[PDB]
Amino acid sequence: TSNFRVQPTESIVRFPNITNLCPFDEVFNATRFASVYAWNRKRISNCVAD
Amino acid sequence: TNFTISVTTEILPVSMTKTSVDCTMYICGDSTECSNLLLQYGSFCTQLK
Ligand SMILES: *[C@@H]1O[C@H](CO)[C@@H](O[C@@H]2O[C@H](CO)[C@@H](O)[C@H](O)[C@H]2NC(C)=O)[C@H](O)[C@H]1NC(C)=O
Ligand SMILES: *[C@@H]1O[C@H](CO)[C@@H](O)[C@H](O)[C@H]1NC(C)=O
Numbered sequence A: 001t002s003n004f005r006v007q008p009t010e011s012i013v014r015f016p017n018i019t020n021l022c023p024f025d026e027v028f029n030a031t032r033f034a035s036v037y038a039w040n041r042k043r044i045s046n047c048v049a050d
Numbered sequence B: 001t002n003f004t005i006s007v008t009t010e011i012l013p014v015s016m017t018k019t020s021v022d023c024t025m026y027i028c029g030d031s032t033e034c035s036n037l038l039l040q041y042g043s044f045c046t047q048l049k
């Protein structure tokens, strides 16, 4: 008729959080912006985003 | 004027390893939404079972 399965109950996500947060305001609240042909690329890595 | 007794081997298969196919967890895994989407496809998995 059917199959036997074990339903999930709790989460064992295993990745400790990074010591700093992602500065998303650097590209959003910058004092000046670049043009479309020559933009500014800011690599955001090793952080926790919101 | 003479006779020879010969023994020969004949191999014929009888059956094979019976397999059961679980359609739901093979196609959609443990996802409930995928199972709900597959439920609109009809009775393919039941027919194959
Ligand atoms: C028919 O063939 C068999 C063997 O295929 C013969 O038997 C042999 O006979 C000789 C002497 O009589 C023995 O030294 C052998 O050891 C025998 N072989 C075996 C396997 O036992 C038999 O003699 C033949 N008969 C005729 C009338 O020729
Ligand atoms: C990360 O985890 C630590 C505790 O290990 C906590 O104090 C901190 O506020 C958390 N936030 C960060 C920095 O990602």
Ligand SMILES: *[C@@H]1O[C@H](CO)[C@@H](O)[C@H](O)[C@H]1NC(C)=O
Binding pocket: A025, A026, A028, A029
């Ligand atoms: C820029 O704007 C964001 C969103 O309003 C605000 O959170 C932030 O404090 C402002 N200033 C800087 C320096 O990011």
